[PDB]
Design an enzyme around this catalytic site. Structure first.
Site, mmCIF file in Angstrom:
data_model
loop_
_atom_site.group_PDB
_atom_site.id
_atom_site.type_symbol
_atom_site.label_atom_id
_atom_site.label_comp_id
_atom_site.label_asym_id
_atom_site.label_seq_id
_atom_site.Cartn_x
_atom_site.Cartn_y
_atom_site.Cartn_z
ATOM 1 N N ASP A 54 0.602 -1.333 -0.041
ATOM 2 C CA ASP A 54 0.035 -0.074 -0.007
ATOM 3 C C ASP A 54 0.962 1.199 -0.034
ATOM 4 O O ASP A 54 0.510 2.175 -0.285
ATOM 5 C CB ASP A 54 -0.977 -0.137 1.050
ATOM 6 C CG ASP A 54 -1.953 -1.019 1.125
ATOM 7 O OD1 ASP A 54 -2.554 -1.317 -0.008
ATOM 8 O OD2 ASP A 54 -2.538 -1.488 2.092
ATOM 9 N N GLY A 55 2.083 1.122 0.782
ATOM 10 C CA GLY A 55 3.027 2.463 0.383
ATOM 11 C C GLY A 55 3.399 2.772 -0.939
ATOM 12 O O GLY A 55 3.358 3.802 -1.302
ATOM 13 N N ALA B 186 -6.616 2.609 8.169
ATOM 14 C CA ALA B 186 -5.371 2.754 8.329
ATOM 15 C C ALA B 186 -5.070 3.464 9.381
ATOM 16 O O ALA B 186 -5.514 3.074 10.580
ATOM 17 C CB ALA B 186 -4.767 3.638 7.315
ATOM 18 N N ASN C 252 -6.642 6.240 11.003
ATOM 19 C CA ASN C 252 -7.679 6.329 11.772
ATOM 20 C C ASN C 252 -8.223 5.312 12.562
ATOM 21 O O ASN C 252 -8.630 5.247 13.671
ATOM 22 C CB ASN C 252 -8.928 6.704 10.642
ATOM 23 C CG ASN C 252 -10.223 6.419 10.999
ATOM 24 O OD1 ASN C 252 -10.873 7.351 11.438
ATOM 25 N ND2 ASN C 252 -10.931 5.032 11.075
ATOM 26 N N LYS C 253 -8.211 3.815 12.280
ATOM 27 C CA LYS C 253 -8.231 2.719 12.758
ATOM 28 C C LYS C 253 -7.551 2.688 14.265
ATOM 29 O O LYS C 253 -8.050 2.280 15.082
ATOM 30 C CB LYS C 253 -8.237 1.711 11.769
ATOM 31 C CG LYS C 253 -8.415 0.248 12.754
ATOM 32 C CD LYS C 253 -8.519 -1.004 11.575
ATOM 33 C CE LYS C 253 -9.035 -2.228 12.410
ATOM 34 N NZ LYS C 253 -7.939 -2.834 13.482
ATOM 35 N N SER C 254 -6.537 2.839 14.088
ATOM 36 C CA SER C 254 -5.464 2.605 15.462
ATOM 37 C C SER C 254 -5.796 3.754 16.274
ATOM 38 O O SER C 254 -5.618 3.491 17.484
ATOM 39 C CB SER C 254 -4.062 3.055 14.790
ATOM 40 O OG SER C 254 -3.581 1.741 14.113
ATOM 41 N N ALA D 163 -4.460 11.332 21.722
ATOM 42 C CA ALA D 163 -4.601 11.655 22.957
ATOM 43 C C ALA D 163 -4.845 13.182 23.646
ATOM 44 O O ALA D 163 -4.215 13.788 23.911
ATOM 45 C CB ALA D 163 -3.009 11.426 23.297
ATOM 46 N N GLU E 229 -5.222 10.014 4.740
ATOM 47 C CA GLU E 229 -5.645 10.920 5.792
ATOM 48 C C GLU E 229 -4.582 12.289 5.566
ATOM 49 O O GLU E 229 -3.460 12.047 5.145
ATOM 50 C CB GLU E 229 -5.550 10.354 7.226
ATOM 51 C CG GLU E 229 -4.023 9.904 7.666
ATOM 52 C CD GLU E 229 -3.418 8.865 6.845
ATOM 53 O OE1 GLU E 229 -4.071 7.974 6.944
ATOM 54 O OE2 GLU E 229 -2.188 8.993 6.572
ATOM 55 N N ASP F 204 -2.016 15.452 21.574
ATOM 56 C CA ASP F 204 -0.930 15.139 20.645
ATOM 57 C C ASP F 204 -1.215 15.669 19.057
ATOM 58 O O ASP F 204 -0.398 16.134 18.446
ATOM 59 C CB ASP F 204 -0.413 13.601 20.639
ATOM 60 C CG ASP F 204 0.248 13.394 21.759
ATOM 61 O OD1 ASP F 204 0.538 14.140 22.639
ATOM 62 O OD2 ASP F 204 0.427 12.085 21.929
#
Ligand code: KIO
Ligand code: KIO
Ligand code: KIO
Ligand code: KIO
Lengths: 264, 264, 264, 264
Positions: free
Chosen positions: C45-46, C162, C164-166, C185, C123, C150
């Protein structure tokens, strides 16, 4: 005894500091900022963190007090209006001391072989130098996980209400001698896997972070943050050292939590 | 010594139990399910939880062992193939014991005035009887919050990998004498406010849940769950009692966590 | 038609690229990396993200295809073994196109007055230059919140799996023309307050981030990240432009999600 | 036109309802609670939800209005003091209408073969009858996951600020025709696996929940909750039907979110 007063530097805190110094002049109290036995911080929790790191080499000879000129702090938990009653009780002495655990961080470098140690009152965190953050997490010499994400945060108990809390960590009463590791935006898919949950470690457990690709990391200790290069290992353990507070009234941790996050 | 073996009841676990009984017949080992000193559980963690509550009145006279015939369990952490080596070492004795903290739950009723106490190895939870769940949370006689939501979960350390984990709680090493409270779908808006974060309590702290509107609640203790009516208070505290495990090898908690959630 | 092939650069992807070029030489297909109508990405994907930004000025004239030589990607969702069948169908044409929404990011500077616009496939994120990150969040000219933390992440639909999910964000099917804002955070106490929840915005809604203290920010767009100075505003909106994929079989988004996170 | 007014039933809402009825008597407005074209709800969001389900068979012939006698609601977003200006504008007419998407829930039973359909304004949820909740989640006839946990919540857009929000879901602007699925305490270990993230589905996607062990479930639709037995399938889809609001001023969704969760 010997005492010093640190100030946030605004007009409100400077004037309160000068009025307390005048009040101490009425007792056998000597102003000494080299070898104080009492360290008063006037400002916020940021001011209190600076005072702690100012005197981190004489922790076992110092009782700390915080006064909040702004909102309530977790360390600066005395009101300015209580300043006069603070002087008297401090001057008389006979007060009780309360001790909170601290976090030891050891940073080992490559090139040759050398170490640096730091003490944290809130937390120590590790992030990458812009590139992807990948580290192997080793717990008591056992490989636990390969972390991919933004970073990791190791918190003391009294630090759990700070950065740890924003990362999803548990709030721990400071009488528990422990440290807590939390994740910052971990990658979890079919091939990459972290535990996800915060981890709480007891005394004598050693958590080691070890580089995989890059040896450069941004390492913070409380408000201090710096780019470490040629890093071979970062080790976290509950410190044998403790910060000592002077206590004059009952202000329970859970009420302080209530007052800071629920209502006041 | 005296010993008993409980079984999940499937063909695999029953046959392993009969083969272990035969192996114990070759030593000075007496099968006794009334006053055993060794309790072997063959099945999963559910089977082990039933064995614990079977003998919760003789906890200090019993060393527990778990064998997993299915996947690895956190309590049933011996493989079936190790069964023969288990008999010998158990028969010879001279083994070490490991102790994990437990959770005490006290339920006080209205009508007149009476109490019931329960012991949890994983957790105790509180939910409502269908209607909205609203309870006042009191910590050491201090009102901490008014919780509105689906329910609350109080976990032991070894329980933190179970229900606690699914609710966002921290994983705590079982050598820490503590309990952890987690929220189930709390309501937070302008007028309703909870802490959100999990809370970790030490020994001798007492957390009390007190009814606001309804006195009926669904209260669970490990796998046991029942509708309590006319409830006036639910009190949580780290128990003075401990569950004792027989240990024969080093299987660290964090490796068990690794093996259960990361990879095996 | 005209086509080009970009490669991750490892031996596996380079050789697959040379074999596909040879296969295209058997048809009326011209290799052109200046004005291609077909852009094939071989890698992960990169690699696919680099191909998108390579040709972002000719989006409406290009159909993209991804081949994964490593694990399954969300954009690189063809296997290397399917390469020969890919050539034929691509050469014949008559294929269908699928379009995914994109994110528009506008960066306005001080000093004088100038703007920069970027297009994101995954994103765009905003973080601080080391110091504390504080920004006012304005939604359609209405002040919504003052964010302390943060950073912030604004994701496209196909980006929701990607970063967003984390961060706790929802996974959105890419047929929804929307963008999703997630927090990194955030600080929440008595005096500081964010919404916490991810926010999902439709077309024509404009989200503006405006500086409070510092004007320097680290702004990322997909894999590109740079320090912007003298920043007065960062505006996010669903782009009017769309990335077009060539499609030859049914590979539903939710199966791709299943295959990437559940099992494959 | 024809109109009716429902009331929370407390002294404050009853008196406001009687005063509005008197005010409508000064215009060509007929009180009719059988075939109204205007439905006014006086109370909170609970009162408004009851009004919606009262008249769910005449949704396309009704414009709803909510008045909050307590705090601000997301549906009851008019103040009591605005009641007189409400009558005039309602009596004159010429108002605009705003439409929000709804959720369709189909419940299929065993024994023989029959179905029940329900409409949700906030969400529909599924939980078990006390025992463990295990369901297969199928998306557009594709098996996506096997969910083990407490339950699942499928929310409308305007429902995302309610139960969905407490479960970690995203807040979605109600102009997006979509539904959002969130998990309640999912079990995730080596052998059990869910996606974790909320899922957002567009129109015409069908999400099916299918029993594995038990056929009994507690199924809720907004405030209504009932035990369904012999359940073979639960299907979720964005409804073709929409709830229509009468609008007289601009009160944007994101300001309503701001006012309810940030500050007011
Ligand atoms: N993304 C993040 N989310 C949450 N916290 C974060 C964070 N990034 C850093 N931090 C914390 O800041 C500390 C450094 N700051 C001093 C302090 C302190 C302090 N200690 C405690 C404690 N024990 N319990 C509860 N609140 C505590 N706070 C409060 O924290 C707030 C956040 N800080 C800022 O906005 C600006 N930073 C500074 O002025 C320096 C302040 O209002 C403060 O009153 C780090 O150590 C890390 O913890
Ligand atoms: N929404 C929920 N999410 C997460 N856990 C939930 C839950 N609702 C209940 N529970 C837990 O179930 C326990 C009761 N079950 C016995 C056990 C056990 C056990 N103990 C531990 C431990 N210490 N660490 C790590 N995994 C542990 N597990 C495993 O837990 C899984 C979940 N259980 C089920 O699917 C069906 N339930 C039973 O068969 C009875 C099992 O595979 C089991 O191997 C409760 O006590 C509560 O904790
Ligand atoms: N803390 C963080 N957590 C999660 N994701 C983070 C992150 N920080 C950055 N990112 C993402 O990385 C993208 C940039 N990378 C290219 C890609 C990509 C990509 N796109 C999608 C998609 N649409 N869905 C699902 N998985 C997708 N992935 C996968 O993402 C993984 C994470 N990346 C890395 O480990 C190293 N980074 C790169 O090589 C450059 C990769 O294995 C990749 O296969 C950013 O755009 C941001 O999204
Ligand atoms: N664990 C849980 N967490 C969060 N929400 C939960 C929940 N369990 C149920 N719900 C919601 O209650 C709705 C049913 N209640 C009517 C309503 C409503 C309503 N709608 C919206 C909306 N659209 N946006 C934003 N706030 C909204 N609220 C507010 O929700 C609060 C929670 N409710 C209660 O405390 C008692 N319940 C009732 O009186 C009946 C109320 O103050 C209300 O003003 C369900 O539909 C589900 O959503």
């Amino acid at each position: 005894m010997k005492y010093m007063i640190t100030s946030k530097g605004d007009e409100k805190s400077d004037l309160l500091r000068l009025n307390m110094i005048a009040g101490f002049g009425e007792y056998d109290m000597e102003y000494d900022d080299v070898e104080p036995e009492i360290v008063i911080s006037i400002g916020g929790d940021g001011t209190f963190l600076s005072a702690f790191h100012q005197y981190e080499e004489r922790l076992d000879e110092i009782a700390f007090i915080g006064i909040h000129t702004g909102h309530l702090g977790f360390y600066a938990d005395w009101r300015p209006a209580e300043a006069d009653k603070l002087v008297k009780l401090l001057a008389k002495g006979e007060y009780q001391k309360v001790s909170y655990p601290l976090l030891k961080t050891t940073v080992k470098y490559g090139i040759g072989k050398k170490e640096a140690t730091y003490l944290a009152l809130n937390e120590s965190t590790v992030k990458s130098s812009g590139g992807p953050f990948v580290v192997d997490v080793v717990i008591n010499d056992i490989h636990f996980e390969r972390f991919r994400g933004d970073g990791l945060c190791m918190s003391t108990p009294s630090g759990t209400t700070a950065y740890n809390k924003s990362l999803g960590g548990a709030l721990m009463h400071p009488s528990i001698e422990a440290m807590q590791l939390t994740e910052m935006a971990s990658i979890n898919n079919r091939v990459y896997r972290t535990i996800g949950s915060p981890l709480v470690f007891p005394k004598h457990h050693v958590v080691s972070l070890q580089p995989v690709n890059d040896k450069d990391f941004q390492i913070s200790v409380d408000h201090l943050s710096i780019l470490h290069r040629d890093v071979q290992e970062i080790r976290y353990e509950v410190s044998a050292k403790k910060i000592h507070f002077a206590r004059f009234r009952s202000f329970p941790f859970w009420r302080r939590v209530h007052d800071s996050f629920i209502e006041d």
